Amino acid sequence: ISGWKDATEFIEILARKQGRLLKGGEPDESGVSKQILNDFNRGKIPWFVLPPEKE
């Protein structure tokens, strides 16, 4: 999923496309956020701090 800004639309579109939602009918933003943080912790989404520049 893409096109998000401020990450609120990110969580909403992700909960909609993933099929996760609270009954009638709001998306479960908290549960999708849990999977987002779990993917960030497990390394499923690549990321790394920039190494310091060489002398």
Binding site: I1, S2, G3, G43, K44, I45, P46
Partner: peptide, 24 residues
């Protein structure tokens, strides 16, 4: 400690690195 080439390692093929997926 001796020389140790880092190129023998193969980075994990994470889904976000592959070019097969794209948007827009």
């Amino acid at each position: 400690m001796g020389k140790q080439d880092l190129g023998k390692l193969q980075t994990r093929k994470m889904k976000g690195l592959k070019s097969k997926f794209d948007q827009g």
